[PDB]
Amino acid sequence: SDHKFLTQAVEEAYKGVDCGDGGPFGAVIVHNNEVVASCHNMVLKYTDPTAHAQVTAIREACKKLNKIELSECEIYASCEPCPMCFGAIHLSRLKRLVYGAKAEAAIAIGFDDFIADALRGTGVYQKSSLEIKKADGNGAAIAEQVFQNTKEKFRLY
Amino acid sequence: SDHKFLTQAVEEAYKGVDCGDGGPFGAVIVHNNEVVASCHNMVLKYTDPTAHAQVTAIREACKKLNKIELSECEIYASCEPCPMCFGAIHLSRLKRLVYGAKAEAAIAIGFDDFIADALRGTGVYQKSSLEIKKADGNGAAIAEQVFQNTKEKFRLY
Ligand SMILES: [Zn+2]
Ligand SMILES: [Zn+2]
């Protein structure tokens, strides 16, 4: 079931970048094989620098379920969550995080080297207990190629 | 000018708790001695675990200035920003952060031990360039007293 929801996140990223909502990032929040929220980066549409794919998905899932905690749901991120999105994932009480592409795949096309210490385990004050899975195989390949595909769809300006 | 805007952030914290919007946290975003945003925690009001005081202040400052970067403004936080809010402050490019109370003052009344390595200078992956000032003297007294005065007035989240 992981592959289906991670691919849906990659499809959210492509749709969002295509319609100009924001960067090529998508996220899907799943409650026990049922999709609760499916969104992409909305920074340019919302004029909100905090409207990343993960944060947007969390806001919409929490509105739909009338709760501020998602301890029964899991989040699928087309790309490794930034420090802000990882913090938001912690606060949301989400029980599991699956992500497809390493932050370096996004850095390769000009994004900030803005990596979450708590996700990679390099923190002194911030420790994460959350279950984290880096996608492998085909899911990782699909997520990983998103950034070169969108840089070359937009290369000729 | 720091004490005046920090005091306004503390006032926002008290407002939000009194009207039930959220926890005792407030934030003020200032552009060149003029207030662009003044907000408090809206987690309970919005059913949104990302609606901290800093995040809310940022979205509203970006709506008022209709831009997704705040490199000319500064933020005053009644309490030390968590990893999510500090990440949002990084992404917003805010140039200065003044905060009143250490996170431990909020932890003492039941909040998560949720501390931002990049703020305290222990981050490896997350590099912060903005100037950060922890308030002392009366600013610290006011910000710390927020938590003993609001004890058992609000719902913990
Ligand atoms: Zn992010
Ligand atoms: Zn916060």
Side-chain angles (χ1 to χ4, degrees), chain A residues 1-156, chain B residues 1-101 103-154 156-157:
Chain A
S1 68
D2 274 345
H3 181 267
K4 182 208 157 167
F5 301 131
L6 182 68
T7 47
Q8 193 181 347
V10 163
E11 211 214 359
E12 278 293 345
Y14 277 109
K15 158 187 190 181
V17 86
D18 200 27
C19 72
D21 281 348
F25 312 92
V28 174
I29 297 200
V30 161
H31 176 17
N32 276 345
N33 258 277
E34 172 175 29
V35 171
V36 173
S38 170
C39 320
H40 48 260
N41 182 292
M42 308 290 282
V43 170
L44 307 170
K45 186 59 170 167
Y46 290 175
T47 320
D48 176 9
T50 78
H52 286 188
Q54 285 73 241
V55 181
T56 302
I58 292 176
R59 294 163 190 170
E60 299 194 8
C62 278
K63 204 273 156 184
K64 191 191 167 182
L65 295 169
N66 301 300
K67 293 186 301 144
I68 68 167
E69 54 92 11
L70 306 172
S71 67
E72 280 157 341
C73 311
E74 312 184 334
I75 183 157
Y76 292 84
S78 75
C79 190
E80 185 183 336
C82 78
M84 174 184 68
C85 290
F86 194 78
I89 290 170
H90 169 278
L91 287 162
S92 61
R93 310 308 164 176
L94 280 157
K95 69 192 198 151
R96 191 165 165 261
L97 156 69
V98 185
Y99 70 95
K102 282 174 311 197
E104 283 83 4
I107 299 169
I109 73 160
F111 279 104
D112 201 351
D113 61 339
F114 187 47
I115 301 182
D117 291 288
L119 185 148
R120 306 210 168 177
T122 68
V124 171
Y125 291 105
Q126 196 189 349
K127 313 285 222 306
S128 150
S129 268
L130 168 73
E131 210 179 335
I132 304 168
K133 171 204 197 36
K134 159 90 181 67
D136 215 3
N138 303 330
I142 289 155
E144 247 190 8
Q145 292 151 23
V146 168
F147 304 95
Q148 271 311 311
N149 283 339
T150 65
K151 184 252 261 203
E152 222 266 315
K153 194 172 135 295
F154 290 77
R155 192 196 285 274
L156 284 203
Chain B
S1 276
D2 280 347
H3 189 74
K4 164 196 178 202
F5 296 130
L6 180 64
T7 301
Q8 189 179 341
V10 162
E11 160 177 20
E12 284 289 343
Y14 283 115
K15 274 42 211 153
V17 171
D18 194 52
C19 78
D21 283 347
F25 309 97
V28 173
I29 301 194
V30 163
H31 176 211
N32 281 346
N33 288 282
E34 199 246 354
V35 169
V36 284
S38 179
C39 311
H40 46 262
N41 182 285
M42 306 289 281
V43 166
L44 308 171
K45 191 66 159 170
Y46 295 167
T47 322
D48 180 5
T50 79
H52 285 192
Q54 288 73 47
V55 173
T56 298
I58 288 175
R59 334 194 99 157
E60 305 212 341
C62 289
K63 268 301 180 198
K64 199 191 172 173
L65 310 180
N66 215 326
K67 49 176 198 151
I68 67 173
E69 62 92 15
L70 306 173
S71 45
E72 76 272 56
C73 313
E74 319 188 341
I75 182 148
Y76 296 83
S78 74
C79 194
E80 176 184 335
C82 75
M84 176 195 68
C85 291
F86 197 70
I89 290 168
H90 174 107
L91 288 161
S92 71
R93 299 168 48 188
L94 278 151
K95 71 195 281 170
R96 195 164 170 261
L97 158 73
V98 180
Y99 69 95
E104 285 81 7
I107 298 170
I109 70 162
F111 280 108
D112 283 3
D113 185 352
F114 193 42
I115 299 184
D117 283 89
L119 180 143
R120 303 205 165 189
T122 53
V124 185
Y125 268 114
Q126 188 186 345
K127 296 120 190 172
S128 80
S129 62
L130 78 154
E131 192 194 332
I132 303 167
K133 180 197 179 80
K134 165 191 244 149
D136 61 7
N138 295 330
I142 288 170
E144 289 167 23
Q145 190 73 27
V146 167
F147 299 100
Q148 305 296 279
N149 283 349
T150 56
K151 272 218 292 272
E152 321 279 273
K153 223 167 83 56
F154 59 99
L156 272 150
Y157 50 88

